């Protein structure tokens, strides 16, 4: 009653086959592989949903048909946010980034992507869930990337809480440290690496 | 028992007043509701332009949203707003809409200034206040289409063969809008509206 709709992992999994509404409407995006065109130009909206059951029907459909889709990059964002760092809701933000080197494609990509999506749709970060914009998976030859995008890179308490809960939900050992990068820093190419604003 | 609020009570909760002590000072609604908007942005596709603005489940959260949109109102031709029960998309193909229809009010260009704002608010108050007794369960939502030629307001219901529910909703809605008995509102099946067969859609009921 003014209260946030929060779902844990077990509940979301028990809904996998009256619909259960989500706090937010979400949009799944894909980028086509056409290198004669810009990323903006290759952006496609796949579908929008705001129920747990519509989430699973979409996830199940993509998971079976993705080997046949022309490209390698998916994004899940809150309704009204484009998965581009120049969006008003992204320009001051950044991302918690998980890098998965080669072996971890076979073993970890599918499980890490799903656990990410469940954190988003289930509002797993308490009031700091409002700082979340979306998540992005980049499927590459050299190694995959999964990231949660947030709206304000100077909100250290929101960003650090998101980071801590995300790492815990991924099951990562405290030994494997994850970094938060400002989109403004990621945009500038200064060598092989981009500065971390925060680490957990 | 169903949480039912009349117009005077909902109007009394508007515009501030009191601290939400114990998180128990807000008046709960029977249903959670979602406000949707359609943008007339031709640089984007229509799936991209249909947006969920906010969800609410108390009277006071309703007014804070309504006041915010009313202040910020573009009111642009081609734009829709819709208020639907949580879990129903404002599209006739939704499982809760496909067998249904709508009670439709059409307003001419000059009625945009006189009647649009009042008719939209009275519609929203009927929805959130559960004004149709047990038949309020048949309501899905309401839609306002703002157009150059003339505006449309409609209450959407879930089942066009529930004659008694549909006729009760129609009767009460016309009364709450303050319309003269001479101005007749029609109920159209979404299945009939979808098919373009000439000059008009069949009304299956009138009040
Ligand atoms: O297995 C798939 O196809 C992946 C995917 C699943 C579901 C959704 Cl919704 C999007 C993408 C796994 C990670 C990227 C590709
Ligand atoms: O004054 C506004 O902008 C209108 C509106 C008010 C409140 C809400 Cl919640 C939605 C839309 C009045 C009719 C449609 C536009």
Numbering used by the authors:
A (entry chain B): 9 to 25, 35 to 217
B (entry chain A): 11 to 217
Paper excerpt:
Here we screen a fragment library against eIF4E and identify a ligand-binding site with previously unknown function.
The cyclopentyl-carboxylic acid occupies the region of L81 and S82 in the compound 1 structure, displacing a water molecule (W2) observed in the crystal structure of 1, making interactions with Q80 S83, N127 and Y76. The affinity of this fragment was much weaker, Kd = 7400 µM with low ligand efficiency (LE 0.19), possibly related to the energetic penalty paid for inducing the change in protein conformation and/or inadequately filling the hydrophobic binding site. Compound 2 binds in close proximity to the non-canonical binding region of eIF4G / 4E-BP described by both Sekiyama50 and Gruner51.
